[PDB]
Amino acid sequence: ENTQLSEAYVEFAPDCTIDHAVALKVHTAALKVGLRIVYGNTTAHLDTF
Amino acid sequence: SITDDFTLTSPYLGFCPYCRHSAPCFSPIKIENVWDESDDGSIRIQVSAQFGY
Description:
Helix content of chain A is about 0%, strand content about 20%. Chain A is mostly beta strands.
């Protein structure tokens, strides 16, 4: 008349802070460009969208 | 809070699937887990005994 109760669940493995995957949903992208416009004798570096 | 006081801790006896006589037996060094995620070839082994104390 002896009953044994078996349990089992799932946890995150200890080494998962390094070996893990991230599932992302990525929407429309945006282009941001770096230019080196040179007018006359003056050079400028600018970042524009 | 995680404790490093092993005076509160005791080793136990596990059930090993393969003892020295190729038979299952109760062992004081039963292997519970083995972890191999290192890129240089090292493994982490858990055992029913307590080393360094």
